[PDB]
Amino acid sequence: PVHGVIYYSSPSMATFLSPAQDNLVRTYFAQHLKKWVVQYKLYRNAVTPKTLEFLKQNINPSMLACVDEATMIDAEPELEDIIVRTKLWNFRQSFTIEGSIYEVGSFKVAIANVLQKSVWKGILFHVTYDGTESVDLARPIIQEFFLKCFLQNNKSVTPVYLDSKLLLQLFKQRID
Amino acid sequence: MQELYLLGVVPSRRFEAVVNSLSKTLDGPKTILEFWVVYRPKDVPPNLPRQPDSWLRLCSNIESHDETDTEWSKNTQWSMYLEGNSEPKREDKCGIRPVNRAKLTNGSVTEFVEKMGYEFSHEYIIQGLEYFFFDTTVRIYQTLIPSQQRSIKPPFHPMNEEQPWILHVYTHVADASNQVAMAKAEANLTKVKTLLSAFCDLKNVRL
Amino acid sequence: VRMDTMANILYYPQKPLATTRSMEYLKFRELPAGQNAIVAILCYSGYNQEDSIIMNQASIDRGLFRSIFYRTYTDQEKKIGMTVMEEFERPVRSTTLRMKHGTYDKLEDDGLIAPGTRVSGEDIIIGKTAPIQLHAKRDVSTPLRSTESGIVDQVMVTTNQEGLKFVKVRMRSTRIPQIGDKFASRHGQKGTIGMTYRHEDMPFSAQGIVPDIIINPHAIPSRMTVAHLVECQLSKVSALSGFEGDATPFTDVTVEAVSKLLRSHGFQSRGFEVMYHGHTGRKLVAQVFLGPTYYQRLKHLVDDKIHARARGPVQILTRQPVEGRSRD
Amino acid sequence: ETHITIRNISKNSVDFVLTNTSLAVANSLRRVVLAEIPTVAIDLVEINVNTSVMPDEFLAHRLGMIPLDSSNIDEPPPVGLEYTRNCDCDQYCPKCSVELFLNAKCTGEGTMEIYARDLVVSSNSSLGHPILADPKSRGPLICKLRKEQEISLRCIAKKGIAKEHAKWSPTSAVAFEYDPWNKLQHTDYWFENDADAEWPKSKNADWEEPPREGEPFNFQEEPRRFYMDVESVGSIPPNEIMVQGLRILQEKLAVLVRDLDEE
Amino acid sequence: MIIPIRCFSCGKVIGDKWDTYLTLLQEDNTEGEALDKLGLQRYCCRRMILTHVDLIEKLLCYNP
Amino acid sequence: MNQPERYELIELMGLPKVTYELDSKSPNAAVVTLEKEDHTLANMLANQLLSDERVLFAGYKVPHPLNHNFILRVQTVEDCSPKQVIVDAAKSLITHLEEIKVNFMREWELKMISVEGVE
Amino acid sequence: YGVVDKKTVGASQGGLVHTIWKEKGPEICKGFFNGIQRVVNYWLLHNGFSI
Amino acid sequence: ILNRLYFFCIQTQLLEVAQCAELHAVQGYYSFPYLTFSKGKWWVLAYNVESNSWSVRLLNAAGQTLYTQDVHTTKGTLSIESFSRLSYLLEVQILLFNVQTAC
Amino acid sequence: RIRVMPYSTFRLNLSVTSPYNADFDGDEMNMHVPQSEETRAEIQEITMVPKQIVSPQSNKPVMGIVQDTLAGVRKFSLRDNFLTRNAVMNIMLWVPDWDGILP
Amino acid sequence: DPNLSLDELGVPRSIAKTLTYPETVTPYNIYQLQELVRNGPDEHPGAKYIIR
Amino acid sequence: TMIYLCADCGARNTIQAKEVIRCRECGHRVMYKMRTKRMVQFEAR
């Protein structure tokens, strides 16, 4: 069940080209990076950092990645924000992942416009498919449908494996 | 989460007799068993929030867990609390303390508060009884000090084994902005106070 | 070097462009009051109205009429007695009485401030003490009027006679042009800034430069001040020449003369020029009289003239409100 | 078709001509180039010792305007840093702001003359390096010194557009002139004694008509053919500016569409 | 004090163009017109090196 | 001292960049309020937006040179939309821009050769 | 008919300003100054005028 | 809102009728209350019915069409859609006629 | 009625300058804020730039279009000045209470 | 300023942040009026002093 | 106590509180004060 989110230098068209496809549709696919910065120093990096991003995997778990970057605990609150707000912690220019996952058939295509606090970042694409096969028995052939509909100006970034793994994979684009 | 509450000691000699005046007429009994760690965020600079609530309180409910089973410390359910303090000028009135009822899901559990670097401090275990009235509930207390740090094995350490039963009616408001649940739940639990007054004398205590 | 109260200098002074052959003596070109500004008389927007002007922000950003405002605080050390001492010791919140809203956190061990510490607000800069458990230390130290800000140029500690110590503190405070500051040419065109348009908005045309400030055409015909005009037609002509154009009071030099000198460089023998709007790109129907001149950065700025009261201090004898200044 | 017809070029300016396009777009390009075009410039100095004659305040404002290399810029991570405002790091970090140094002293007794040369970047071939408009010189002048008047400055640049302070625009001015004779009469020339006789024909006037007749004048006619002429500071090559002009002008139109087709 | 650097109206850098300017109107027998040899076609800013006062040589000689 | 913050010129203070809202009066006509971006984007969707026969009105005007924004009214009347009229416009623009972005990157190096080289 | 100048939009006797004031009281009366002093300023912005 | 109940419950009905002959009725190509009907697997030739009325309105735009009013069109099911396809084959022969009329 | 701009001067309305016989030569003008809700009423219902546009000194107006907006009127009320359809539109967004209907 | 209604006057925040203008607590205000205090006297939409 | 600097020489006078204002290896009696360290926050506008 290989993951394969792709960043793109040619946005906008996802809202436009995918509906232009003659095929079927499903629901929402939006998620949100949220950079953090402790109001004082000390807690600066690593295990005890300014760094933090609760990660809004809105689509399924509804559970934030309560993660100070590579610090693995997860929770819905939110209430934890206020807990973190004890005369503490700020933000930084995170870029949210939001969109448009749709039913297709043997495979299905998650879609999301990506948004820096500076408004825009650049659309990501994903296609879930059966996992019994080895990584590339058909993944490039799946990418034939990344060329159908044709997709352009893709970034080289390649997160790789259900979808809970995408959480760590967010970092793969977050660390960029 | 604005908890509203009171306090009233029950000597153990009259305790279960009170329970007869309670559980027969109420939901429960439910024995409580939850291992605390009230970690203190020793931090710089002043003015620190420094208040007892400001110190963190990871809250591992374990009541169904074995008294000797080893997986507990980061597999059995945990929680966390800072909570706001009960209201100023809350004389005799049930104390109103907003609460962040944290929850968590990973093999890592405690670690994040030390990922926040927070130091260990005092610890105990809620171990009393609780009796429902819808969203409201009474929570009579038992808070034995654990036999060793991160040790779930009894006997534990009440300040006296002639332990006071710190009876404690309560409720949990979602948000304090409306007058509704204020006077409403205060009335219902004041009537609950009338019920306990048939066998006890609860009071507010500053927090 | 001169420690001096209230001083105002120019970041970038300039020679009057079109000047009279009578300044060589007034040593004026060596220490100008002026500053040459690509001016353009246009009726554009409505913020440059009835004796008022609108200036280009791009310019003020690179230094148009940027000035400095040194102020200096004098303070000696009176001694009557008997033998009553009064040193510049740093007030100690252990037996003073009385002085709040400091902060004295900015005084050195010397009880004096060190340049160039960013001073603002009612901050204090020196500290006094006058004898009378825990007694007794008074406070006759001088604070800093809130209305002022900025860093501290330098301090000079010497001796008086008298026979004690004697300190002087000077702080600098850059002052930029802001809506509401005065400017006027050398013809009594008292003007005030009405607005600050950024570079794009202003009529970029077609050369294409941009007016540094633009006065309104109704400040001409009634105040008959045809000199303001002439100067600008002549300043221009120290374009492709640099020939410092003399403006000598009575000479053969005429309008009809300078004009010929104009198309001589490719322009309109009369000052004018076509002008392109900043929003659209449309040519303006009318032709603009665009042409340099120097305007003088007048004193008395705005941030010194604003005033607001509301339950402030009051006299002791009459118990009515104090007068201007103070606080406030 | 075409759309542009360049004439002369140099190292600081780019003279050319727009063709099949509308007035709006013209202007809207003039503007773009004069304002919102990302660049590096220094926007924070810390002073240690300064016993020179230029005050600290006066240096900041001056050290600012001195142009720097920008080149690519909009192409992270390296060879381009994103605004220091929306950065993944905290406060100020070399990952989104380039550090500069100035340690000028005095070893002479005559007179010193410190130029833009004496500064020191870091060695991260950003850049970076300021510029040297002067011919085989050393850069724009900063300050003068006599005896012992060493100054010590820490400078760090951020990213900004003219809008935010005229300090950034890498663009001097622009010199357009659509309809050089007077086809559309978008202007009423002031006489004073004889019209087409007082106003000078323009160098760019020799590329059109419609003298003679008495057609009479047209009106179905819109202004096309615009004679622009962009000149850069020397901060970033002479377009550059233009090229990067539409890249962040298209993307400004897009913002719009995406905020209307998603919902 | 010293050339403005960056003309008031445009952006045309003028910090560079003076150490070289002064070495003509007093060292090459060319006119005020000579600046034209420095790329000063606009008014504009070119009245910048021209209308300027060298207020630092005559300020620098106050040594502390 | 009362100088608005410059950075508050290029950064929406939690203000929704775009806002689309009908009018009344007029019928089949809405009014768009782009914020912290104006005097450039606006002029285009006009002297170009009015080029679509589908249109019957083209607002556009900054309310005050202090607030960095601007409105845009479009009427049409009668079939759609007019959220679609301005987008069909915007699209026609981005694509008309490249028309020149390409000619530029094409004729540049082409008149770079005549001034010697080499290679 | 004719042309607007001070004769009619200035404090004249039977002045236009006078005539809507006075029919029908201030406002839209108060708006009159806002309209013309807004419409025209806007016209003039792109009409240019100077001497 | 009752009309919402009507069109929606009927939507589910037709979805059950959409099973065999996978007439997907994806709504992206127009968002009308008239509601799109479509087809499996699929330049595009549209498919529309309403009353229900068998108006084979193939369109893009608007391609050349053909129309019928067979059946009471209340009861289903899948077989009737199969008949629609049976018509649509003759419609393909008619596409060849469309190729004939081009010249 | 206050409100509320930035920059440290009092912006006021040009057509109101005549009554204050004073230009912008860097003049100062005083502001007195009422307190009690009973005076707030006086200086609203009796004294108001609006209800004061006609002093009884002369039973003639005391404010009127003057300066640039005036010079402008002439140079625009001329029947030599036509408006391109191109706006019109633009200039219609002041009125400020617009019928909505284009003339 | 050409852009203010006639009966309009531009008041700089610097001043607005130092005036008043008491205003008793109406039963219509309590909520609205409170927000002001909780805001601060340094935030335009704020206040100074509370009288009892 | 602190250090002071003379108007002419500039040599470190490093003189003590409450004494006499003057110098050491020279003359004149004034003196300014060394600039603090002090890395100071300065915008470039």
Swiss-Prot record, chain C:
Mg(2+) binds at residue 51. It is found in: Nucleus. Belongs to the RNA polymerase beta chain family. DNA-dependent RNA polymerase catalyzes the transcription of DNA into RNA using the four ribonucleoside triphosphates as substrates. Second largest component of RNA polymerase II which synthesizes mRNA precursors and many functional non-coding RNAs. Proposed to contribute to the polymerase catalytic activity and forms the polymerase active center together with the largest subunit. Pol II is the central component of the basal RNA polymerase II transcription machinery. It is composed of mobile elements that move relative to each other. Component of the RNA polymerase II (Pol II) complex consisting of 12 subunits. The binding of ribonucleoside triphosphate to the RNA polymerase II transcribing complex probably involves a two-step mechanism. The initial binding seems to occur at the entry (E) site and involves a magnesium ion coordinated by three conserved aspartate residues of the two largest RNA Pol II subunits. This is DNA-directed RNA polymerase II subunit RPB2. It comes from Schizosaccharomyces pombe (strain 972 / ATCC 24843) (Fission yeast).
Curated annotation (Swiss-Prot), chain D:
CDD domains: RNAP_II_RPB3. One of its GO terms (biological process) is transcription by RNA polymerase II. Changing residue 26 to P: In strain: Isolate TS99. It comes from the Eukaryota. It is found in: Nucleus. Changing residue 4 to L: In strain: Isolate TS99. GO terms for cellular component: chromatin; cytosol; nucleus; RNA polymerase II, core complex; RNA polymerase II, holoenzyme. GO terms for molecular function: DNA binding; DNA-directed RNA polymerase activity; protein dimerization activity. InterPro entries: DNA-dir_RNA_pol_30-40kDasu_CS, DNA-dir_RNA_pol_insert, DNA-dir_RNA_pol_RpoA/D/Rpb3, RBP11-like, RNAP_Rpo3/Rpb3/RPAC1, RNApol_insert_sf, Rpo3/RPB3_RNA_Pol_subunit. Component of the RNA polymerase II (Pol II) complex consisting of 12 subunits. Belongs to the archaeal Rpo3/eukaryotic RPB3 RNA polymerase subunit family. DNA-dependent RNA polymerase catalyzes the transcription of DNA into RNA using the four ribonucleoside triphosphates as substrates. Component of RNA polymerase II which synthesizes mRNA precursors and many functional non-coding RNAs. Pol II is the central component of the basal RNA polymerase II transcription machinery. It is composed of mobile elements that move relative to each other. RPB3 is part of the core element with the central large cleft and the clamp element that moves to open and close the cleft. This is DNA-directed RNA polymerase II subunit RPB3. The gene is rpb3.
Swiss-Prot record, chain F:
One of its GO terms (molecular function) is protein dimerization activity. Its main location: nucleus. It holds the Pfam family RNA_pol_L_2. One of its GO terms (cellular component) is cytosol. It is found in: Nucleus. Keywords: DNA-directed RNA polymerase, Nucleus, Transcription. One of its GO terms (biological process) is transcription initiation at RNA polymerase II promoter. PANTHER family: DNA-DIRECTED RNA POLYMERASE I,II,III (PTHR13946), DNA-DIRECTED RNA POLYMERASE II SUBUNIT RPB11 (PTHR13946:SF16). Belongs to the archaeal Rpo11/eukaryotic RPB11/RPC19 RNA polymerase subunit family. HAMAP family: RNApol_arch_Rpo11. This is DNA-directed RNA polymerase II subunit RPB11. The gene is rpb11.
From Swiss-Prot, chain J:
The tandem 7 residues repeats in the C-terminal domain (CTD) can be highly phosphorylated. The phosphorylation activates Pol II. Phosphorylation occurs mainly at residues 'Ser-2' and 'Ser-5' of the heptapeptide repeat. The phosphorylation state is believed to result from the balanced action of site-specific CTD kinases and phosphatase, and a 'CTD code' that specifies the position of Pol II within the transcription cycle has been proposed. It is found in: Nucleus. The binding of ribonucleoside triphosphate to the RNA polymerase II transcribing complex probably involves a two-step mechanism. The initial binding seems to occur at the entry (E) site and involves a magnesium ion temporarily coordinated by three conserved aspartate residues of the two largest RNA Pol II subunits. The ribonucleoside triphosphate is transferred by a rotation to the nucleotide addition (A) site for pairing with the template DNA. The catalytic A site involves three conserved aspartate residues of the RNA Pol II largest subunit which permanently coordinate a second magnesium ion. The C-terminal domain (CTD) serves as a platform for assembly of factors that regulate transcription initiation, elongation, termination and mRNA processing. This is DNA-directed RNA polymerase II subunit rpb1.
